[PDB]
Amino acid sequence: IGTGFPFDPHYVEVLGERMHYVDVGPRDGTPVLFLHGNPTSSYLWRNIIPHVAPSHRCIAPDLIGMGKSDKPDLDYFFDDHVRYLDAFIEAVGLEEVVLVIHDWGSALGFHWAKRNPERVKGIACMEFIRPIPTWDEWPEFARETFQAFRTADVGRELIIDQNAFIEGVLPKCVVRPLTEVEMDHYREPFLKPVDREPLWRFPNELPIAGEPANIVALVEAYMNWLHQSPVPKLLFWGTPGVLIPPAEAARLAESLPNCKTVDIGPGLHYLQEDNPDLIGSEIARWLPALHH
Numbered sequence: 001i002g003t004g005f006p007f008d009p010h011y012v013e014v015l016g017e018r019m020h021y022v023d024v025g026p027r028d029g030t031p032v033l034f035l036h037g038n039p040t041s042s043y044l045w046r047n048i049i050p051h052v053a054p055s056h057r058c059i060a061p062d063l064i065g066m067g068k069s070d071k072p073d074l075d076y077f078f079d080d081h082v083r084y085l086d087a088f089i090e091a092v093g094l095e096e097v098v099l100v101i102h103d104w105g106s107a108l109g110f111h112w113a114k115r116n117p118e119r120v121k122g123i124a125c126m127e128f129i130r131p132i133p134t135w136d137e138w139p140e141f142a143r144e145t146f147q148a149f150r151t152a153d154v155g156r157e158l159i160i161d162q163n164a165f166i167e168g169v170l171p172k173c174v175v176r177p178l179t180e181v182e183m184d185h186y187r188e189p190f191l192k193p194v195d196r197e198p199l200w201r202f203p204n205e206l207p208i209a210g211e212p213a214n215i216v217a218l219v220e221a222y223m224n225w226l227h228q229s230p231v232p233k234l235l236f237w238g239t240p241g242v243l244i245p246p247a248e249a250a251r252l253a254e255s256l257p258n259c260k261t262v263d264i265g266p267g268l269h270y271l272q273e274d275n276p277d278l279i280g281s282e283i284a285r286w287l288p289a290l291h292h
Helices: 078-091 103-115 140-149 154-161 164-172 180-190 193-205 213-228 246-255 276-286
Strands: 010-014 017-024 032-035 058-061 097-102 120-128 233-240 259-267
Touching (some): 010 078, 097 103, 103 120, 120 276, 140 154, 140 164, 140 193, 164 180, 164 193, 180 193, 233 246, 233 276, 259 276
Parallel strands (some): 032 097, 097 120, 233 259
Antiparallel strands (some): 010 017
16 A cells, blocks of 8 residues: 655645645546545545546645644634635635545535535545434444543543544554554644644534534434435445444445445545555546436
8 A cells, every 4th residue: 555645735725724735637527526534634545546537637635724734723613624625615616526535524525515416426435424323323442532532621631732643543443554654644734732623623523422513413414415315426334344334334325325335345444544446446437427
């Protein structure tokens, strides 16, 4: 699995801040917009993009506060991410798109799709955010951890002061062992502890056990939309998975319209790090029939 990031930087100024993005591929078709989550960046898509770039433009932003994007002193609520990503999409001039989304990038992608359904020609997703109605429905191995993250004292200690999301959660949620070179790519945006705010706010925004109520309602709304939308969907899943275990992937194959599921083999949360070549090749193969 490749460890390099051979993509030239592109920047756009949005809402007073610079956002970095990958932009490769032809300009005369429907671009594929790749949205990472917590605590990652466009680096997560590095081995997937090369499968798609031959046929389609690939745009992969670093969310505000993350990657090579600027790091204003925000609360980094989901709503902040929504504002910045909405502005990003317009600034690069995207009209119709295909989404490829994961984790908080999936909450952003599904929320944008619900609001702009005519502009979304397909959605490839994996390990995506839907409501977790009770703590029992959160994976047991991660329950204590995320309960502690969702506090103003211990959670800030662990995530901001000690870098637990980068040094702990990230490698624990890839089956194969991340190398030190890969870890240094993930560490780079967050070398200064104070810049770790988004990494703490994100788990505090997850729609778990009814809290926070605004996120639960928003995520329920996009999931209602997704369940009724005829848009083509491609869902990757792994064993044992984290947010989307095998039996839940199978349920989604039945309960989402026009959905194809792809078993990637071993995987936890960051499926892109366990089997990028199958994820990329399957996205590439699935794109042509979306055109018409």
